Amino acid sequence: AIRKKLVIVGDGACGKTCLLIVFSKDQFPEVYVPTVFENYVADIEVDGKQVELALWDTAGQEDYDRLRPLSYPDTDVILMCFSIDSPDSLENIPEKWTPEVKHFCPNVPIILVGNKKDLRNDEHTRRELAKMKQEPVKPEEGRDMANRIGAFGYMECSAKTKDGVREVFEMATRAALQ
Amino acid sequence: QNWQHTVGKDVVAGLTQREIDRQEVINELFVTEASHLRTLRVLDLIFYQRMKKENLMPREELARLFPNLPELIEIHNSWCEAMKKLREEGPIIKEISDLMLARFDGPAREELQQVAAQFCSYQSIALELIKTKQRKESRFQLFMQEAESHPQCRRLQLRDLIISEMQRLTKYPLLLESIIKHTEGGTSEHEKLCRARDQCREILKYVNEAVKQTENRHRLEGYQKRLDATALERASNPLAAEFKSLDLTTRKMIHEGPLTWRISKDKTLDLHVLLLEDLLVLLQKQDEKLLLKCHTFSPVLKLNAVLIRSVATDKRAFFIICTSKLGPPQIYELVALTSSDKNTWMELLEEAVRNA
Ligand SMILES: CCN(c1cccc(CCC(=O)O)c1)c1ccc2ccccc2n1
């Protein structure tokens, strides 16, 4: 069996847990969104190959700078997330997550993911970000951050619609295999 | 797998969306507590008890890998059994704050943080040892494959399961925030839940700190062995010689990291640097040795005798200015890997200086 370890990192607001749930279940949870995603092995095929992808959530670890590194060893691919309705989460990519991940996972491929893409054009969202004088992240900005940080690839998704979710993980898995 | 289905099926209609949601989160808490307990019993039965019974490793090593597992299990089992008790009085759980306080407040908090901290603090080091052992000892590598093939492992490895306690603690605040969210305000219930949430954070800070100090201590012992402060057994400039017998083991580390030293205008020196409580120490990597060495410039700075300044034209660089009248008229000009790193290094340097 080919075994790879994926770890998901990013700000606490950015939907890490939920993303793992829809990948793993192939379903957005209808009536209730779980807070807890336990360490778990998912099966996935990419490019012919069968892979066992050990999934690790880090939700809840964002304030604890010496608990986080405990998830890092032997990582094969990092999913770094921000949320498209939060340019703050985007700016933490280079400011917080990238140096941490390069320090604890040298040469491990990174995929940058813009979650919540379904909100780029939700008006409640546009207006809220109006107030703090902001607006939803744009793919060009996402994409430029991705080259900025040396990411292996950039991807957007919406957990609610499942749109791009599989594709996120398929990319992460290809990066794990390179 | 979900409260509105499962239990509370005929009892659902009676309730508001808020109270449905409150029940769901409480249910998740309960179900994932039992689940967590399951994982600990897997650690016990598949790994710990077998390693012990078949002498896979010296008892001194095994105790470092599994310090207090039975105690850890009882922390969670007791709480788990109180959850069962409460579920007994009907599928709609009423007040829950006292059950939360019985685990996360007062004495119960002290007990949980001690036990969780003892279990986790040394874990990164023990797991590196296990990894070495598997590479070097065929009987051990074999045993680990067999144990990990058990279906109870759910295809995970020991290193993937043993971290479950730390991970479980990180979920409690989140599970409490979500319950609180669905609890009517103005209630004692609500206030007491907030108190529990806050104490869980404090517990995480305590475990965070134990891991930090335990790992840092081990790291500095290793550095000490590799420390060569020999060129300071002599002296050039007076202010280096007092650190000829510098002992890293007796200080606390705040931060560490690579920095490039702009020593002249076309010379640089690539450093690894330790920020301790009272000193900044500049080391040169030289194979596997850490060289404490002049250039002249001193390699140790006292944090009570320096100032820290940003550089307006280089977002990766910062200055350290020695303030002793015996100091160098030159500033240490240091370069970090990124602007972010430089922000981190400065934030921490300034803080340490304020407390020096
Ligand atoms: C509570 C549901 N949720 C969400 C929001 C913030 C954080 C999280 C997961 C917590 C984390 O893993 O950081 C999930 C999501 C998750 C995905 C979403 C996609 C599109 C629109 C809304 C979405 N909301």
From Swiss-Prot, chain A:
<dbReference type="GO" id="GO:0043296">
    <property type="term" value="C:apical junction complex"/>
</dbReference>
<dbReference type="GO" id="GO:0005886">
    <property type="term" value="C:plasma membrane"/>
</dbReference>
<feature type="binding site">
    <location>
        <begin position="115"/>
        <end position="118"/>
    </location>
    <ligand>
        <name>GTP</name>
    </ligand>
</feature>
<comment type="function">
    <text>Small GTPase which cycles between an active GTP-bound and an inactive GDP-bound state. Mainly associated with cytoskeleton organization, in active state binds to a variety of effector proteins to regulate cellular responses such as cytoskeletal dynamics, cell migration and cell cycle. Regulates a signal transduction pathway linking plasma membrane receptors to the assembly of focal adhesions and actin stress fibers. Involved in a microtubule-dependent signal that is required for the myosin contractile ring formation during cell cycle cytokinesis.</text>
</comment>
<keyword id="KW-0131">Cell cycle</keyword>
<dbReference type="GO" id="GO:0030521">
    <property type="term" value="P:androgen receptor signaling pathway"/>
</dbReference>
<dbReference type="GO" id="GO:0005634">
    <property type="term" value="C:nucleus"/>
</dbReference>
<dbReference type="GO" id="GO:0032467">
    <property type="term" value="P:positive regulation of cytokinesis"/>
</dbReference>
<dbReference type="GO" id="GO:0099159">
    <property type="term" value="P:regulation of modification of postsynaptic structure"/>
</dbReference>
<dbReference type="GO" id="GO:0070062">
    <property type="term" value="C:extracellular exosome"/>
</dbReference>
<feature type="binding site">
    <location>
        <begin position="158"/>
        <end position="160"/>
    </location>
    <ligand>
        <name>GTP</name>
    </ligand>
</feature>
<dbReference type="GO" id="GO:1903673">
    <property type="term" value="P:mitotic cleavage furrow formation"/>
</dbReference>
<dbReference type="GO" id="GO:0071345">
    <property type="term" value="P:cellular response to cytokine stimulus"/>
</dbReference>
<feature type="modified residue" description="(Microbial infection) O-AMP-threonine; by Vibrio VopS">
    <location>
        <position position="35"/>
    </location>
</feature>
<dbReference type="GO" id="GO:0016477">
    <property type="term" value="P:cell migration"/>
</dbReference>
<dbReference type="GO" id="GO:0071526">
    <property type="term" value="P:semaphorin-plexin signaling pathway"/>
</dbReference>
<feature type="cross-link" description="Glycyl lysine isopeptide (Lys-Gly) (interchain with G-Cter in ubiquitin)">
    <location>
        <position position="133"/>
    </location>
</feature>
<dbReference type="GO" id="GO:0034329">
    <property type="term" value="P:cell junction assembly"/>
</dbReference>
<dbReference type="GO" id="GO:0021795">
    <property type="term" value="P:cerebral cortex cell migration"/>
</dbReference>
<feature type="region of interest" description="Switch II region; involved in RAP1GDS1 isoform 2 binding">
    <location>
        <begin position="59"/>
        <end position="76"/>
    </location>
</feature>
<keyword id="KW-0206">Cytoskeleton</keyword>
<dbReference type="GO" id="GO:0101003">
    <property type="term" value="C:ficolin-1-rich granule membrane"/>
</dbReference>
UniProtKB/Swiss-Prot annotation, chain B:
<feature type="domain" description="DH">
    <location>
        <begin position="21"/>
        <end position="210"/>
    </location>
</feature>
<comment type="function">
    <text>May play a role in the regulation of RhoA GTPase by guanine nucleotide-binding alpha-12 (GNA12) and alpha-13 (GNA13). Acts as guanine nucleotide exchange factor (GEF) for RhoA GTPase and may act as GTPase-activating protein (GAP) for GNA12 and GNA13. Involved in neurotrophin-induced neurite outgrowth.</text>
</comment>
<comment type="subunit">
    <text>Interacts with GNA12 and GNA13 through the RGS domain. Interacts with RHOA, PLXNB1 and PLXNB2. Interacts with SLC1A6. Interacts (via DH domain) with GCSAM (via C-terminus). Found in a complex with ARHGEF11 and ARHGEF12; binding to ARHGEF11 and ARHGEF12 enhances CDC42 GEF activity of PLEKHG4B, and PLEKHG4B, in turn, inhibits ARHGEF11- and ARHGEF12-mediated RHOA activation.</text>
</comment>
<protein>
    <recommendedName>
        <fullName>Rho guanine nucleotide exchange factor 11</fullName>
    </recommendedName>
</protein>
<feature type="domain" description="PH">
    <location>
        <begin position="252"/>
        <end position="354"/>
    </location>
</feature>
